[PDB]
Amino acid sequence: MKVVDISKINELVKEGATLMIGGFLGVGTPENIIDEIIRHNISNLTVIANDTAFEDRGIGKLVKNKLCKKVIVSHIGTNPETQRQMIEGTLEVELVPQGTLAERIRAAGVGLGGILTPTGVGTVVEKDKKVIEVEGKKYLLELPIHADVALIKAKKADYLGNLVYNLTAENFNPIMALAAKTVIAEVEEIVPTGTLSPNEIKTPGIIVDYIVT
Amino acid sequence: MKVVDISKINELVKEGATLMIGGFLGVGTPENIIDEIIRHNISNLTVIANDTAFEDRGIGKLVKNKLCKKVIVSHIGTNPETQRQMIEGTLEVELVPQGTLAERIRAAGVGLGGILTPTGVGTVVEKDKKVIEVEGKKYLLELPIHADVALIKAKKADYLGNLVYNLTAENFNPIMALAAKTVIAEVEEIVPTGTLSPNEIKTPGIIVDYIVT
Amino acid sequence: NPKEKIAIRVAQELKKGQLVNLGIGLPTLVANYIPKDIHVFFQSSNGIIGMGPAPKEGYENSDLTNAGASYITALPGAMTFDSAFSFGIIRGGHLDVTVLGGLQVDEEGHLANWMIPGKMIPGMGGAMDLVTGAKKVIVAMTHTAKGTPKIVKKCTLPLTSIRKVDLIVTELAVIEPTDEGLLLKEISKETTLDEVLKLTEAKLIIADDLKIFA
Amino acid sequence: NPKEKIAIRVAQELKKGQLVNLGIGLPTLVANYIPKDIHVFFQSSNGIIGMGPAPKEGYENSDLTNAGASYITALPGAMTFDSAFSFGIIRGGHLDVTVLGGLQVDEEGHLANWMIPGKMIPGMGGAMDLVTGAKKVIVAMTHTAKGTPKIVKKCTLPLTSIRKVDLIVTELAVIEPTDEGLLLKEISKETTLDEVLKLTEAKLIIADDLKIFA
Ligand SMILES: [Cl-]
Ligand SMILES: [Cl-]
Ligand SMILES: [Mg+2]
C-alpha cells in the first residue's frame, strides 16, 4: 500500500508546506510530482533543494508559477526568473554552500543538533551563525534543516519500497529521504523483492511512506 | 601500486601509532593485518574501534598480547582481558556511545569540526564535554577523531582499489577509510575493473592507499 | 516463565509494519511471540534492517550476525549498511520501537541499564543512542532484583539517558511513565495489587482503567 | 587563445593519479590538455569520481551529467554517490586539486569568484567548500577584467573563502601566494615584466629564477 496515484499529492502536500525536493539541475528530480503540484496550484512553498534548475524544468517550474514563498538552495544562476523574483522581493532566497546544505539536511535525518564546518568562515555566510573554535580552527555552527515532505526521485523500488538510484541522479535524494517527516518517492520501475540486494539498496523501504508511478 | 605483501605491515604501522580498525565483534575485521601486527610486536598502540571483540579474535588479540596502551571504543564487555587491563591501569579505555563514535570518526573523514548529539546528555558521558542548546534542546559537542592508519576489511576490490563490503561486515570500515591519513584495506578477492558498478561501490579507490591479499 | 510472561506481553505492543530493535537478552525472546498476523522488521545496530532468525545448520554466513556476533539470516528485502547509517536510523527517529532490558527505571521514566559500579563494566555500546532516539522505548525487566525494587523513586545507577521511557513491562505490571509520574495500567493475573505496590519503591498512580493481563 | 594559454599551463601542474575537480567554464578546458603520459581522475560535485568526456551522439544517459547538467561519460572504475559523500571528499581533504575560475585574487591569496554585487547572483554552489577543502587550489583567470586588474591588494568582491589559494594562472603570469605576499614565478612568452606589473594592482614579489611559459 505504499504505491498511490499521483492524484494523492493534494492530500499530502499542504499549502505553505516546507518541502525538500531532490535533484541536481533537474537530474534526479520528481518531475511528475512537480507537475501535479502545479496542476493543483499548491503554493506558498518553502522549497529546500540544491538549485531552482531551469525555467523550463523540475523545481524551476514551481518557481515560474510562483508557488514558492522561499527557497533554501545553494545555486540559482541557471534560472533567471528565480533571480528576478528574489530581487523584486517576492521570493526569499537563503543561499547555503552546497556541502553545508548536504550536511544540514543530513543532520536532521540522522538526529544531530548541528554540525561544525569551516566552509563559509570569513564570508557573508558567517552572518548570524555561532562560531566555534576547536583546537584553534574556527567553524560555523550549521543547524539541522527539517521539512514536512521530502519529494525524491529514484530509479527503482522493490515491493517493500527499498530504493536504488542511478549515477548522478542520486545527489540529494537519499539524504532528504531521511530528514522529512513524510517521504514521497517518484520512481521509474517497480521490481520484485529480491531484485535489489541488501548490499545495493541505498534507501530502506521503512522510511519511504508513499511511491508514485 | 596499491596491492602489497602482508609482510609490509611492519613498515607501515609504527610503534605508538593511532589506528582505526574496522569490525563489529570481529565481523568485518582485517584478521590477517592484525596477525601481522602480533607477529612483530608492534605495540604501544592506540586503537579506535567499536569494541575489543573477544580474547581469541580480531582486536581482542591485540589486547591479549598487551600491544595497546589505549582503546577508544563503545563496548568492551565481551572481552574479560580488556576489562582486566583497564582495572589494573595498564590499558586506558575511553568509552564512547556507538553512534557518537560513528559520527565522530565520520566528522574527521568528511572535514567537520564536530557534531552535536543528544546521545549522552545527562549521563557520565556529558563530563568534560561542551554543552550546546539549539531550540531549547541540549546537545553534546563531540569532536573529530583522527588516526594515523585505518585498518579496514572489505569483500572485494577492483584493479583501481574500489571496494565493496558484505552484509554486516560493513559496519565501521567505510567510515574509518575516510578518517585516517593512510588506509590499508584487507580484501578477500581482487576483481577486474568493471566488476564493481558505479552504483554499487562504497569506498572509492582514490582514498585507499594499500591493499593486502 | 517470568521471562515469557514479559516477552508475550511486550510482543502484543508491536503493530504491523514497525521497525523494531530488540536489545540482547530478555528482549530477544519477544520475537518468539509476534501474533503471526503481525509482521515487523527487525533492525540490528551492527548494520541491518531486515534481520531474521538464526540459520539452519550449514546456512551460516560469516559476515551476517546480530549485535552479539551470532549468526543470523536476512529476509527478502533486507538492507545492510555502515554504522553511521545504522545510528541515523536509531538516533534520527526512524526506529519505531526498541525493547531493552533494565537495571532500574525511576519515576521520571529514566532508564539505567548499561553499567553497575564495581561489577559490570561492559560499556554502553548503542544503548544510549537507542534509548535517546527510538520513537518508543519499552523496558522489559524482572520486577525485582532478587527482591529489591528495580522501579525506584530516582535511579541510583548510571543513567543510560534522560529520555522518558514509554513503557515498563515486568512479570507483574505494565507501567507507563507520564507527566504526572508513573502510571500503573495493568497487573499480572498471577499476582495482586497489594504485592505490586509493595515491590515498587516508586510512587505509582493506579488507573481507573486497571487491567489484568501481564 | 588567451584561455587556451591558461588551460595548457594549468594542465602541466597536474600529477599522476590525482583526484582533480574542474570548475565550470575556463577550468574545464584544462581537460583538453593533459599530457598523454599523465592519468588523473575527475570528480564532479553533483556526485561522480571518474568523470570523462562528453559522450558521442546516441550514448547519452539522462542521469549522468557534469555540475552543469551537461551530458558526460563515466570511465571504468567510476563511483557515483550522494551529495553528502561528494562534499565529504571535498571538505575532508581527499580532493587533490581543484581548478576554479576567478573574479579577484588578493595579496593574501583570497579568492572572490561567486558573486558580483548588483550584476550576478548565481549563488556559491560548491565553490566555498572546494576552495576551503582541496589539498591544492589553482585559480585560472584572465589577467584583467577589460583592463581592470583582477590581482589586487584586497578583494572588494565577496570572498569565496579565507583560505590562501596555492597558484594563480593567467594568460600573462604564474603567481604562487606565499607567507609574505604574492610571488611571481613565471611570465608569459609574448608579454614583458613591465606589462605584468602595470596590470597588477597587487604587490608582487619577483622570483630570482623567473621563467617563460604562461
Ligand atoms: Cl535458513
Ligand atoms: Cl563513448
Ligand atoms: Mg516517514
Domain holding A55: CATH number? 3.40.1080.10
Q: Which run of H or of E encompasses A137? A: strand A137-142
- Other CB atoms within a 10 A radius of the CB of residue D35 amount to 11
Identify which of B26, B117, B125 has the shortest CB distance to residue C69. Answer: B26
Does residue C30 sit within a domain?
Answer: yes
In this complex, the residue of B109, B162, B207 whose CB is nearest that of residue D77 is: B162
* Cα–Cα distance list, B80 to B73, B84, B85 (Å): 15, 6, 9
Question: For residue B138, is it within any domain?
Answer: no
Task: Please check whether residue B110 touches D, CB under 8 A.
Answer: yes
Binary contact (B206, D84; C-beta < 8 A): no
B144, B178 Cβ separation under 8 angstroms = no
Nearest to B33 by CA among B180, B148, B168, B150: B150
Contact B159 D48 (CB under 8 A): no
Asked if B touches A (at least 3 Cβ pairs < 8 angstroms), the answer reads: yes
D74 at interface of B, judged by CB pairs closer than 8 A? yes
- Grid cell, residue B171, equals 559496519
Ligand nearest to the CA of C59: 1
Within 8 A by CB and 6+ apart from A58, the residues are A21, A23, A25, A26, A29, A31, A34
Angle between helices C83-91 and A98-110 (to 10 degrees): 60
SS3 state at C172: coil
Contacts (Cβ under 8 Å, ≥6 apart) of B183: B149, B150, B152, B176, B177, B207, B208, B209, B210
Place of cell 571504468: D76
Nearest CA-CA partner of D103 in D49, D37, D170: D170
Q: How far is B199 from chain D (nearest CA, A)?
A: 6
Asked if residue A120 is part of any domain, the answer here is: no
Q: Which amino acid is at A106?
A: R
Q: How far is CA D122 from CA A27, A51, D112, D126, in A?
A: 19, 10, 13, 12
Q: Which residue of B has its CA nearest to C78?
A: B167
Chains near C with 3+ CB pairs less than 8 A apart are A, B
Instruction: Residue D17: give its domain's CATH number.
Output: 3.40.1080.10
Structural domain contains residue D62: no
Domain count, chain A: 1
> Does residue B133 lie in a domain region?
no
Taking the Cβ of residue A115 and every Cβ of chain B, the question of whether any pair is shorter than 8 Å is answered with: yes
Q: By the 8 A CB rule, do D26 and D6 touch?
A: yes
In eight-state DSSP terms, residue C91 is H
Q: Does C50 touch chain A (CB under 8 A)?
A: yes
Contacts of D49 in chain B (CB under 8 A): 204, 206
Residue stretches of the annotated binding site of C for Mg(2+)? 194, 197
Ligand nearest to the CA of C71: 1
Which chain B residues contact residue D84 at CB under 8 A? 110
Distances (CA, A) of A127 to B113, D17, D43, D61: 18, 39, 30, 40
Q: How do beta strands C19-22 and C41-44 pair?
A: parallel
Cα–Cα dist A14/C28, whole Å: 41
Is there a domain that residue C156 lies in? yes
- The length of chain C is 214
Query: Residue A135 falls within a domain, yes or no?
Result: no
Residue C192, domain member (yes or no): yes
**Least Cα separation, residue C139 to chain A (angstroms):** 22
Ligand 3 centre distance from Cα of residue D142 (Å): 50
Q: Is residue B136 part of a domain?
A: no
Mode of pairing for the β-strands spanning D19-22 and D97-100: parallel
Residue A136 lies in a domain: no
Domain extent, residue A57, equals 6-114+144-212
Cα distance between residue B118 and residue A107, in whole Å: 12
Alpha carbon distance A98, D126 (integer Å): 5
Domain that holds residue D159: 2-42+83-213
Has residue C27 been placed in a domain?
A: yes
Query: Whats the size of chain D, residue-wise?
Result: 214
- In whole angstroms, give the CA distance from residue C95 to residue C74: 18
Residues 6+ apart with CB under 8 A from A182: A12, A148, A149, A150, A209, A210
A27/D65 CB distance under 8 A: yes
CA distances to A102, A123, B32 from A72, rounded to whole Å, are: 12, 18, 49
Q: Do chains C and D touch (3 or more CB pairs under 8 A)?
A: no
Shortest Cα–Cα distance, A56 to chain D (Å): 13
Sole residue written with cell 539524504:
A175
Shortest Cα distance from B79 to chain D (angstroms)?
Answer: 34
Report the candidate in C46, C52, C55, C47 with the shortest Cα–Cα distance to residue C34. C52
Residue C70 lies in a domain: no
Give the experimental resolution in Å: 2.6
Domain count, chain D: 1
Residue D8 lies in a domain: yes
Q: What is the CA radius of gyration of chain C?
A: 17
Does residue B13 lie within any of the structural domains? yes
Q: Within a 10 A sphere around the Cβ of D201, how many other Cβ atoms?
A: 16
Q: How far apart are CA C8 and CA C3, in angstroms?
A: 9
Indicate whether B46 belongs to any domain.
yes
The Cα-based distances of A207 to A176, A196, B103 in angstroms read: 11, 16, 21
Contacting residues for D192 by C-beta, under 8 A, at least 6 apart: none
**Is C61 a member of any domain?**
no
